[PDB]
């Protein structure tokens, strides 16, 4: 990673840390159905809420700015990826650099997505990609929604806002 890329990652890491902190606080204080929760995680029920609450509790504990970043990947369509059992290392690809720091499909949101994938943080899977698929997963299969990385990213980004 170049100096500029490291600078960009410092901004993205900070924003991702804030996304996770706010999302965790939101989950801790809302123990009933709300538009933001149901849209990304489906019908509210204690067990599922507990699952997502735990994911954000784990991600909140890790220092995003201390992750080991790798910028060798040049694949244009890919934002980033990680190996679940190789905690703390995040590989950035082409799309990551085109994405805005915050917002929809952002750098910060991408880090939240990847962070949730680490086994240490809960090991979310990729059952659905994109907002359309994520929302459909939440409505049709909540069990997998609370285990889908993109559903966490979109809940955190919260753009447009709902809460
Ligand atoms: C999630 O679903 C609930 C209904 O179960 C709504 O209150 C919310 O707007 C979101 O679509
Ligand atoms: Zn993923």
């Amino acid at each position: 990673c170049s100096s500029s890329e490291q600078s960009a990652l410092a901004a993205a890491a900070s924003a991702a840390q804030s996304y996770v902190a706010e999302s965790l606080s939101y989950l801790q204080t809302h123990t009933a159905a709300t538009p933001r929760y149901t849209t990304w995680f489906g019908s509210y029920i204690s067990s599922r809420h507990s699952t997502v609450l735990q994911h954000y509790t784990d991600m909140n504990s890790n220092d995003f700015s201390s992750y080991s970043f790798d910028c060798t990947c040049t694949a244009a369509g890919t934002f980033a990826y990680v190996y679940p059992n190789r905690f703390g290392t995040v590989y950035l690809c082409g799309a990551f650099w085109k994405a805005p720091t915050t917002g929809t499909d952002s750098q910060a949101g991408t880090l939240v997505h990847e962070s949730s994938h680490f086994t240490r943080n809960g090991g979310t899977k990729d059952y659905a990609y994109g907002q359309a698929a994520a929302k459909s997963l939440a409505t049709m299969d909540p069990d997998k929604a609370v285990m889908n990385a993109d559903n966490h990213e979109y809940f955190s980004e919260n753009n447009p806002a709902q809460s």
Side-chain angles (χ1 to χ4, degrees):
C1 303
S2 62
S3 293
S4 57
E5 292 167 351
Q6 294 173 39
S7 290
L9 285 163
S14 173
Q17 200 76 69
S18 295
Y19 266 172
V20 175
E22 186 274 339
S23 295
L24 175 59
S25 184
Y26 183 101
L27 292 169
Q28 293 176 328
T29 72
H30 291 109
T31 50
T34 57
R36 186 175 175 191
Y37 181 96
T38 78
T39 299
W40 304 114
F41 300 130
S43 287
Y44 185 100
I45 194 169
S46 68
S47 64
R48 287 181 206 128
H49 170 262
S50 172
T51 297
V52 299
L53 171 68
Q54 297 195 20
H55 293 168
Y56 282 100
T57 297
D58 283 337
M59 291 189 269
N60 180 75
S61 76
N62 66 29
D63 184 4
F64 279 72
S65 71
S66 290
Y67 278 171
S68 290
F69 296 109
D70 181 291
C71 308
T72 65
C73 179
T74 59
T78 304
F79 285 81
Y81 66 88
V82 304
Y83 297 116
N85 298 325
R86 175 174 289 255
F87 179 82
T89 301
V90 182
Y91 304 82
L92 302 314
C93 296
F96 185 81
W97 312 112
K98 292 190 297 284
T101 311
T102 52
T104 297
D105 289 345
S106 59
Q107 293 187 337
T110 293
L111 295 179
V112 171
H113 178 116
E114 295 310 315
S115 177
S116 74
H117 273 319
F118 290 134
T119 306
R120 180 180 298 198
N121 298 326
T124 55
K125 274 65 171 57
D126 289 310
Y127 288 123
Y129 176 99
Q131 286 194 345
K135 287 181 294 181
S136 175
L137 186 66
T139 302
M140 290 180 79
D141 198 347
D143 183 71
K144 305 302 177 296
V146 298
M147 283 304 291
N148 191 53
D150 247 13
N151 283 78
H152 286 65
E153 172 173 354
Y154 295 131
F155 173 82
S156 293
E157 290 177 349
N158 192 208
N159 181 226
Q162 285 188 284
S163 279

